[PDB]
Design a protein around this ligand. Structure first.
Ligand code: NA
Ligand code: NA
Length: 261
């Protein structure tokens, strides 16, 4: 038996993470706006299998004026690697980041306590994601809920630039050519303010616009899955993708250097 009880799926490869689907078949159900307490409803994507144990859960928020159609592709992509994922609609499409932060947590609370798939979820292993203003809400949710295992703001937008109290492992994904949430005034200031004692990363998509997260994106999928695996599942099999080194090679038992050079 693997020492880590939360490991799911076979040993990862670059190819499996770049593919459109992970190893788990995915089913879906929905929660209506009326049934959703504290948010505007959503779609739940979950692994059909339960025989390998429970999974961590992730809530994903869209951005200003947007609905869950703008983040829908993330549902099957992440769930197929062994996660229960809810893509939410917000109370109103004009909600600000700090409101979206509260709705992300309300969605996780619904998943854990009242959803039809609650029995597939390990309530102690939760994460938050979001696009644009929903990425700003992801940062605020992480700051206010340090028990979260991971946070992934996608091209985030927020007026607050100081996130030095965030103790949740955070992967910020920025778009190089973003003109709506320019990385020079949003994503990068956010990352620079995160504590160095918190596991963190900043990934910038080459030549990408603010809307890159709204359609299938191999890079977003690979590193988002790797981040969630590493920190929601404590799955160190995915460190090779977040912190590559020559000793990932099976022929190399050790590699040390004074890189970068
Ligand atoms: Na509601
Ligand atoms: Na150096």
């Amino acid at each position: 038996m693997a020492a880590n009880p939360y490991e799911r799926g076979p040993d990862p490869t670059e190819a499996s993470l770049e593919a459109s689907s992970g190893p788990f078949s995915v089913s879906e159900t929905s929660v209506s706006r009326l049934s959703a307490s504290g948010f505007g409803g959503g779609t739940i994507y979950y692994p059909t299998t339960t025989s390998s144990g429970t999974y961590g859960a992730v809530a994903i928020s869209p951005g200003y004026t947007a609905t869950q159609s703008s983040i829908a592709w993330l549902g099957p992509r992440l769930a197929s690697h062994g996660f229960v994922v809810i893509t939410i609609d917000t109370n109103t499409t004009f909600d600000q980041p700090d409101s979206r932060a509260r709705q992300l947590m309300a969605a996780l609370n619904y998943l854990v306590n009242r959803s039809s798939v609650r029995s597939r979820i390990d309530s102690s292993r939760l994460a938050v994601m979001g696009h644009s203003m929903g990425g700003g809400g992801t940062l605020r949710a992480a700051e206010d809920n340090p028990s979260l295992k991971a946070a992934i703001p996608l091209t985030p937008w927020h007026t607050n630039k100081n996130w030095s109290s965030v103790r949740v492992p955070t992967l910020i994904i920025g778009a190089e050519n973003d003109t709506i949430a320019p990385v020079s005034s949003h994503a990068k200031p956010f990352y620079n303010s995160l504590p160095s004692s918190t596991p963190k990363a900043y990934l910038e998509l080459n030549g990408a616009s603010h809307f890159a997260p709204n359609s299938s994106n191999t890079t977003i999928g690979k590193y988002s899955v790797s981040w969630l695996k590493r920190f929601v599942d404590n799955d160190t099999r995915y460190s090779q993708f977040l912190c590559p080194a020559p000793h990932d090679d099976s022929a190399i038992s050790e590699y040390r250097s004074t890189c970068p050079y």
